[PDB]
Amino acid sequence: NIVTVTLNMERHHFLGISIVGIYIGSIMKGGAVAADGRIEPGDMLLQVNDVNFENMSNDDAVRVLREIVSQTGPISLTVAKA
Numbered sequence: 001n002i003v004t005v006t007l008n009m010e011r012h013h014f015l016g017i018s019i020v021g022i023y024i025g026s027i028m029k030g031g032a033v034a035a036d037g038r039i040e041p042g043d044m045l046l047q048v049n050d051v052n053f054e055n056m057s058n059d060d061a062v063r064v065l066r067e068i069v070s071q072t073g074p075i076s077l078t079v080a081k082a
């Protein structure tokens with residue numbers, strides 16, 4: 001089950017996720033992801049905007065998320081539900 005979740009990123013500064021395939025390791029208080037509710041811990045992160053996460057190292061995925069969260073605009077996260 002694959003779901004795409006688009007977040008406006010206007011009411012919250014950060015996603016509020018940790019990443020540990022790349023999985024959502026945790027969802028944190030105060031982030032856009034927790035407020036939205038559609039993504040859950042354990043979901044597998046497949047794509048963020050136009051960046052596919054296949055074969056990506058954890059360090060590179062953190063760098064990608066940092067760069068995307070730092071730029072203004074919506075963020076679309078495609079996950080496979082746990």
Ligand SMILES: CC(=O)/C(=N\Nc1cccc(S(=O)(=O)Nc2ccccc2C(=O)O)c1)C(=O)c1ccccc1
Nearest residue numbers: 013014015016017018028029030031062065066069070
């Ligand atoms: C809720 C939340 O998000 C949190 N800290 N967030 C966060 C932390 C570091 C870098 C980025 S980041 O701007 O570089 N963006 C990311 C880069 C990599 C992976 C994930 C993110 C992300 O946004 O989740 C976002 C917190 O609990 C928090 C607690 C106290 C004070 C401030 C924040």
